[PDB]
Paper text:
CD4+ T cell responses to IAV, mediated through recognition of short peptides presented by HLA class II molecules on the surface of antigen-presenting cells, are essential to multiple anti-viral processes that confer protection from severe symptomatic disease during IAV infection (Wilkinson et al., 2012). We focused on the HLA class II molecule HLA-DR1 due to its high prevalence in the human population and the pre-existing molecular studies using this HLA type (Cole et al., 2012). Unbiased epitope mapping of the entire M1, NP, and PB-1 proteins revealed five IAV epitopes that elicited robust and reproducible responses across multiple HLA-DR1+ subjects. As part of our structural investigations, we solved pHLA crystal structures of three conserved IAV epitopes used for clonotypic analysis (HLA-DR1-SGP, HLA-DR1-QAR, and HLA-DR1-GMF; HLA-DR1-PKY from the F11 complex included for comparison).
To find structural mechanisms underpinning our observations of strong peptide-driven V-gene selection, we solved the structure of the F11 TCR in complex with HLA-DR1-PKY at a resolution of 1.91 Å. The F11 TCR (Holland et al., 2018) has been shown to bind HLA-DR1-PKY with low μM affinity, comparable to the HA1.7 TCR (Cole et al., 2012). Both the F11 TCR and the HA1.7 TCR (Hennecke et al., 2000) share the use of the TRAV 8-4 gene (enriched in clonotyping; mean, 8%; n = 5), and yet, each has distinct CDR3 sequences, encoded by different TRAJ and TRBV genes. The F11 TCR bound to HLA-DR1-PKY with a canonical binding mode and exhibited similar crossing angle and overall binding mode to HA1.7. The total number of sub 4 Å contacts made by each TCR to HLA-DR1-PKY was similar (F11 = 103; HA1.7 = 104), as was the proportion of contacts contributed by each CDR loop to binding. In contrast, CDR1α contacted the peptide by the germline sequence SSVPPY encoded by TRAV8-4 in both TCRs, suggesting CDR1α may be a factor in driving the observed epitope specificity. In each complex, the CDR1α loop was located directly above the N terminus of the PKY peptide and the same two peptide residues were in contact with the germline component of each TCR, regardless of differing CDR3α sequences, TRAJ genes, and TCRβ chains. At the CDR1β, the less-enriched TRBV24-1 gene in F11 formed one salt bridge to P8Lys at 3.8 Å, in addition to three van der Waals interactions with the P5Asn. The TRBV24 linked CDR3β of F11 positions two charged acidic residues near the P8Lys, one germline encoded and the other the result of recombination. However, the germline-encoded (TRBV24, IMGT: CATSDL…) Aspβ93 was limited by orientation within the CDR3 loop, being positioned away from the P8Lys side chain and not forming any contact with the peptide. Instead, the non-germline-encoded Gluβ94 residue formed eight van der Waals contacts (3.2–4.0 Å) and positioned its carboxyl (-COO−) side chain at 4.0 Å from the P8Lys amino group (-NH3 is colored red in Figure 6C).
Residue numbers in the entry:
A (entry chain CCC): 1 to 13
B (entry chain EEE): 0 to 239
C (entry chain AAA): 3 to 180
D (entry chain BBB): 0 to 189
E (entry chain DDD): 0 to 201
Amino acid sequence: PKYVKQNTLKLAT
Amino acid sequence: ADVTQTPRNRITKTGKRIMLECSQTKGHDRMYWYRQDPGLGLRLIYYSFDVKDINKGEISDGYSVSRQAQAKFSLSLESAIPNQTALYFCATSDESYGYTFGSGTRLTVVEDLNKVSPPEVAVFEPSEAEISHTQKATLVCLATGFYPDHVELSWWVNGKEVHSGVCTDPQPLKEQPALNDSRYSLSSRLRVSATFWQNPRNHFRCQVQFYGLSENDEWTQDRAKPVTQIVSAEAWGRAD
Amino acid sequence: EEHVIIQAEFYLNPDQSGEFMFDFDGDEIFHVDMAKKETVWRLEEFGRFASFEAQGALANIAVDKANLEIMTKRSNYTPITNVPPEVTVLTNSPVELREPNVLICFIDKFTPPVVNVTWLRNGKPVTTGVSETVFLPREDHLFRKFHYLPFLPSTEDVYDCRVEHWGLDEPLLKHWEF
Amino acid sequence: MGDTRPRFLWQLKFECHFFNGTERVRLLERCIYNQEESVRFDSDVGEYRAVTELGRPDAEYWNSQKDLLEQRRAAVDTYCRHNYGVGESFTVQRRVEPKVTVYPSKTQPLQHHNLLVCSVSGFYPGSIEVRWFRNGQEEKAGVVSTGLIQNGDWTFQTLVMLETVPRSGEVYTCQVEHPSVTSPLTVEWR
Amino acid sequence: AQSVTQLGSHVSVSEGALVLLRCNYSSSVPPYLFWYVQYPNQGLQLLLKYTSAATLVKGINGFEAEFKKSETSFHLTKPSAHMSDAAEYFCAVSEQDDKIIFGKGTRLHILPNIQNPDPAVYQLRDSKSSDKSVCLFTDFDSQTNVSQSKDSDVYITDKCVLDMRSMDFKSNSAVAWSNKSDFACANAFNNSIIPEDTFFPS
């Protein structure tokens, strides 16, 4: 059984 | 294009270290190298999620990579073997599984550069019997005696590249299927209306782009050095 | 019932320090060792029932790093205000003579997440058997940390946890005797 | 560190909140610059919101991307409910029996004011009742406790002391109710 | 073991008919799923992506795919096959691990609607020489297949489909050639089952 991360998003540039 | 690979086409002899370059402009942290082979899909070689971060994929053996900068991801064949002949694709990913693939690198690894040979190209004119039976006209292009299997064939009508009415064999056949380094042949058809064929000012060219030896490569043979070159053959229309 | 699972990450410049950890109701389940690309289970048991692809943490930290640079530029290079830690020193269990216990130094309510912790036994800095947790999250976005020293309890030995942090004007020295 | 340089800190929290197990779940994503939250996604709202002016460009850019917002909402199932089920056996269902000892704080004759100590340690989860009994009867007046101590360890400890005058033949029982026990633990002092 | 299984390296569909390409997946984790297309002599293009947002995923050109957890499937469909749908199609999975694992790929072949077949074997002379020629078998319907030569000095191509946009007209063809002195267009396709009505001009 595998934990999943949630992805960090890139801020607006 | 966000993602660009160089070179687009490479021939190399076995036992040589060769490097493929990927560069991107969208400043993405995730980069990947895949290879594509018939019947096996894309297999992941290596992947990188940051500068100097390196991770092995499914098939890392015989390969290395570097990620010195965010913009660039380098793939090296350590000691090229023939089964590393493939289409190689660099990809970037955003933060939500949005992949951008490069247009690809066609790499051919040959055991012996002495066997490299450009195509002879011939154009075969439509038969009167076809014109009179169908009111259409089929030209055939044959490209023969080339090695390795690393060509692109196109048709040019009145100096313009045409896609309409063209079929090219999806893969060349071997002139000597018993031999490991057999030369190849490829055919293509261009079909036009008889009225278009019958106009003697119309010019038809079948062009074969051959990928072969570079300036660098040594050449000890009497026949011309088999460099990357275009070979073409041409036919004019005829009223008959 | 009521449970909370937190995925907590940070990146700190110019130290170039980043952490990735999961929290269940205020205890750490695991963190990722970035150097070795290994998931570190807070108890070894947990690694027998579950897995985590450590490499995933490095993609998030890469993006944390890019976002910290953007926010830094947006703020016109406004730095963080240092918040000094509170230090509690206590025992893992009640304390019996010549029955090995463990000394906890609990460090709480501090930012940024950079501290230097020293264990002094009778004035001597001691390193034998020492371990620590990573920088743990709090609801106010400050940090908690645990430092651990296994030891033999006796009336002979006196203990100090010494903490240094940029928010303090001198090191905090917290005492323990039996 | 004698190093004087200014520091810049980026923190990220994904918070999964579970009510009655996975019956009700809430997801909070939090972007935090120099200890101040700038933008958050709350599953109860279903889009990004600036917590400060610095966050406004990020709320606006992220909320711009319909497919992005759709996945962030699905994550209550594909992230929160999933990870809950991964950890349940060793997390939610973790039970570790307390060690319970009771001793006087002073060895002294009968008929004198004493402090009887009930230390309860090594236990998980945190939920627990310690109750003090004199010869069978409970008492609430002189009960003092150090409250619940988190060891960082996946274990808790607590003291509950009892102010009391011990008398000839008196038996004192510490009664501990914890989820790990089919029925309360009891340790006596005579 | 994240995997995706596609059935059939090479599949056929009639022009105008429903397109169905199969994909089954294996994941411990609720997955990302993808379909990509590779059009001839080009790169990889995303058609659609499953994100758990919705079980019916919609893409460019009428493509759609339905996630069915209970049969772990993600079959790609398109209502009507066009000649321009001829391509290789790849299904792909990520167990939420920020890498895409690809299936082996299926090439879709479109059989053109040949309403008026006119099978014929023509001799074509070289532009440059009255001494050189090839044989063209053309204008046969979808029920004829070309076999490879039994004779190592006779070369025969696979059948190809061309689309003459100038006359909205599609046709099948195969080419045969030889340097052999005894090679004639009447014998070139003797190893193939050809239509009884094939036209052999004088």
